[PDB]
Each structure stands twice: as structure tokens, then as C-alpha cells.
Amino acid sequence: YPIGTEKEPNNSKETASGPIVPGIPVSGTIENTSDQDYFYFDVITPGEVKIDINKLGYGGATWVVYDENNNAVSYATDDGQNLSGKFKADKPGRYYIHLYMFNGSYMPYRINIEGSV
Ligand SMILES: [Ca+2]
Numbered sequence: 791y792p793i794g795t796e797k798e799p800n801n802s803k804e805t806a807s808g809p810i811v812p813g814i815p816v817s818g819t820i821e822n823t824s825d826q827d828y829f830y831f832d833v834i835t836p837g838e839v840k841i842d843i844n845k846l847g848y849g850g851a852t853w854v855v856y857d858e859n860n861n862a863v864s865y866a867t868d869d870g871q872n873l874s875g876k877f878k879a880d881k882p883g884r885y886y887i888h889l890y891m892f893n894g895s896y897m898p899y900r901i902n903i904e905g906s907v
């Protein structure tokens with residue numbers, strides 16, 4: 791049952807919206823800098839995962855991906871418009887995308903994931 795949009799409240803790892811799978815974009819909005827948005831996806835077989843989150847508003851945002859044990863495995867790079875990154879998933883399991891805005895009023899976004907998901 792893959793998601794095409796966030797489902798609030800998703801403001802902690804324990805309420806993360808998902809699963810997110812490749813080929814199905816996921817919409818949402820960072821309501822303001824207090825709105826944390828967490829998502830999850832499931833790695834079934836080891837392999838590369840690529841993440842691109844399109845910024846559809848103004849502001850400074852970023853993401854980090856945590857594995858099931860709360861280790862950071864990937865950090866976004868901002869190109870101005872898109873927040874992107876990739877990592878090698880050596881173990882199957884659930885991964886959590888933590889998306890937040892450190893400066894900005896309101897930010898619609900679109901999440902795309904690719905690879906071993
Ligand atoms: Ca949100």
C-alpha cells in the first residue's frame with residue numbers, strides 16, 4: 791500500500807508516513823519551521839537508494855536518512871531547487887527520511903525515490 795502524500799501527524803520516526811516506493815511521487819508541505827516531516831521506505835534486498843526531494847516553495851530545508859537503529863546513512867545536498875542524495879543499503883530493513891525546514895515560512899515539496907526499494 792504505497793503512499794502518494796504525507797499523512798499528518800508524522801512528526802516523529804514512530805509516526806512516519808510510508809511506505810514510499812520508486813515510480814510513485816509523494817507530495818507534502820512543510821507548514822512552517824516547527825513542522826517536522828518523517829517518512830519511511832523498506833529495503834527488501836541490499837543495493838543503492840537515491841532520493842530527490844523537489845522544493846516547491848521558498849526557504850532552507852534539508853533531509854537526513856536514518857536506518858532502523860538511528861544511525862545516519864545519508865544527508866541531502868542542496869542544489870538550489872532540489873535536495874538530493876544516495877547511499878548503499880547493505881542490509882534490508884526500514885529507513886526513515888527526516889525532512890525539516892530550518893528557515894522559511896511554508897514549503898510544498900515532492901519526494902522521488904529510486905533504486906533498491
Ligand atoms: Ca507536513
Ligand SMILES: [Ca+2]
Pocket residue numbers: 798799800801825826827828
Ligand atoms: Ca509533520
